[PDB]
Structures are given as C-alpha cells and as structure tokens.
Amino acid sequence: ACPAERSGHVAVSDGRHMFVWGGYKSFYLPREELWIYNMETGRWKKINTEGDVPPSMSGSCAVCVDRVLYLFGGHHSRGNTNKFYMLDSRSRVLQWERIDCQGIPPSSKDKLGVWVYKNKLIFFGGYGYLPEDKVLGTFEFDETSFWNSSHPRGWNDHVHILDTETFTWSQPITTGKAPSPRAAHACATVGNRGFVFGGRYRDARMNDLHYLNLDTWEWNELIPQGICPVGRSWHSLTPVSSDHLFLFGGFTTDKQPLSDAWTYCISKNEWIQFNHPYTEKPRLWHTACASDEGEVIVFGGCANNLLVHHRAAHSNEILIFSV
Ligand SMILES: COCOc1ccc(-c2nc(CC(=O)NCC(=O)O)cs2)c(Cl)c1
C-alpha cells in the first residue's frame, strides 16, 4: 500500500524516481524490500530484490549514479559493516551485487556522507569500530560505547575514494585543515566542491561549514557573514541549483528537534532562512532528494528525540519543499 515509517533509511533519486531502502522503526525494515516514489505523480511502488541482498541496516550511505545504486556501510543486527553493494535499476528482477573491492576499505561505520565526482565516490567521516590498522586521518573514541556494548565505537575524519573504474579503495593526500571527526553530518556536491555542514562530535552538534576541492584535495572553511543556522546533526543538505544548497531539520546539541529550513548561497557565502508550512513537523534522520522541478522531497525520519526509543515518533510522511 504505502511504505512503513522508518528512520535511518537511505533514499536516492535520479530527479524523477526516489528509491528508499532500509531504516528501522519501533526492528529493522525488511531487507529485500525496495520502495520507489514517483516524484511527478506521488505514487509509491514496492518491489522485492534478490542477489547478494545487504543485511537490513540503519545509517547506510547510498548514491544513485546513471540509475545504478551504490550502498556502503550501515549498522545491522550484528553491528557495523564496511561492505559495498551495487543495485542496477536500469532493466528483470533486480539483483543486488556485493562488490569485492580492491585496496584497503574504510573502517566499518555508519552515519557518514559521500560526494559523487566523475568516476569517484568520495566518503567522509562516520561512526563505527576502531580501524583494523592505521588509516590516514584521526579516529576518536566515544566514551559511552565502552560500557554499553561489547565493541566500542567512535568518530572519524577519514576521506576514502572508491574509484568505479576498477572498484579500488584509496585515500587522497589532502591539504588544508580538515573538519573534526564527526558523524550525522550532511554532505552535498556542487561542481568540484564537496560541501559538509554540521555533525555530532564529542559532546557537541556543530554548525561549521567546509568544502573539499575534489580536483586538488584541498580543504577550505567557509565563514558566512551574518546569521547562521544553529548547530545540528541528523539534518539534510541538498543541492538545488548550481548556487544553492537546501538545509532542513535535524537535532541540536541541547536535544531539540528542528523544523527550520535554509538555503546557503554559494556565490554570496550567505545563509537565507526559508519559509515553509512544515514548522510543526521537525524531522531528524530523515532523507531529502531534489526533483527536476526544483523541489526537495523529504521522507521518513523521527519527529522527536529518537534516542528515547519507546517514545520515538517515526514518520512515513512526504514533505515537499518548493524552492
Ligand atoms: C541501530 O539503531 C539505531 O539507533 C541508534 C541511534 C543512535 C545511536 C548513537 N550514535 C552515536 C554516534 C553519533 O554521532 N550519533 C549522532 C548524534 O548523536 O547526533 C552515539 S549513540 C545508536 Cl548507537 C543507535
């Protein structure tokens, strides 16, 4: 009929159709299901996948390139993973493919972000286990995870490249000052600039903005003039044009669910707050996808503090923002 409510799912789009997989609610959602939303008509459609179906997961990182889907990472019932999957959505019953990649993969983690640039999928940050061996960057343990679970976890500032020409992992030699290790940040790509805003680190949910030059591997920090959005994690950051990123929702340091929306103007280096009718619908750990008609499609996520699991208000609403 319609997709069940969920948080921490993935959603990717080609501008017409939005593909939704995974997430959890109050147990993980069925791993074989793939929900497809038509951005032009508003109808959903459920299909069942086969092949090397990934385990049902929260916090995975997914992209849609040339109508083929790539999925990295996430948290399943036995923990975090660093496996890589692809799902060709061009043609026949769709088959997931686990890709045995070459090179040193990233550590097993979730709640990260990715930038697409030509043949490269570029992943940044996240939360998961200590890397099996030293990795270019820094890993910072989360104290609370030691006593809660068998395997402690922590945040990282790693940058990894999966080159789709050969499916080989590598780490670029970056210059500049990289952002601190973080998870639940939001990543967005415009041209050769890989933007990242916000995220959780230590005891803070941050408000800084940075971009990585995807042609020179140089980190730059952006300091916009005037009023800026409150620091947050579990928010969405979506390119809406060559010159504007759309920001919505999330979760403050003081654990307040957010319903504000902003546009970040790249050319002017300025934030502009966006009026919308969903002020009473804060979401965090939702997804957001841009349509070819200048809209942003938000789905799922939780309306309150999802860390109180027995009171968590997960959603299956579609919120349309006209930009
Ligand atoms: C597998 O079911 C999902 O339910 C959850 C939801 C959240 C967490 C946590 N994530 C962190 C790391 C972080 O930066 N979290 C982002 C932040 O704190 O703003 C600390 S607690 C966990 Cl383990 C399980």
Author numbering: 27 to 52, 61 to 125, 128 to 359
Question: What's in the article?
Answer:
However, the introduction of a nitrogen atom or disruption of aromaticity on the ring led to a loss of activity. This SAR campaign led to our first lead, SJ10278, with enhanced potency compared to SJ6145 as measured by SPR (Kd = 8.8 μM), competitive binding to a degron peptide (TR-FRET IC50 = 24.1 μM), and thermal shift (ΔTm = 3.5 °C). To understand how SJ10278 engages KLHDC2’s di-Gly binding pocket, we obtained a crystal structure at 1.95 Å resolution. Superposition with the structure of a di-Gly degron peptide confirmed the ligand targets KLHDC2’s substrate-binding pocket. The acid moiety of SJ10278 is stabilized by canonical contacts with KLHDC2’s R236, S269, and R241. The thiazole and chloro-phenyl moieties of SJ10278 contact adjacent hydrophobic and polar elements typically engaged by consensus degrons. First, the constellation of hydrophobic residues surrounding the chloro-phenyl moiety suggested adding hydrophobic character to this portion of the ligand might improve binding. This is particularly evident in electrostatic representations of the binding pocket surface, which shows SJ10278 adjacent to a hydrophobic cleft in KLHDC2. Secondly, comparison to a bound consensus di-Gly substrate showed that binding of SJ10278 leaves space in the pocket.
CRL2KLHDC2 has been proposed as an attractive additional E3 ligase handle for targeted protein degradation. Specifically, KLHDC2 recognizes substrates possessing a Gly-Gly C-terminal degron (C-degron) sequence. First, crystal structures showed KLHDC2 binds substrate C-termini in a well-defined pocket lined by aromatic residues available to engage a ligand. Ligands were identified that engage the C-degron binding site in KLHDC2, subjected to structure-based improvement, and linked to JQ1 for BET-family neo-substrate recruitment.
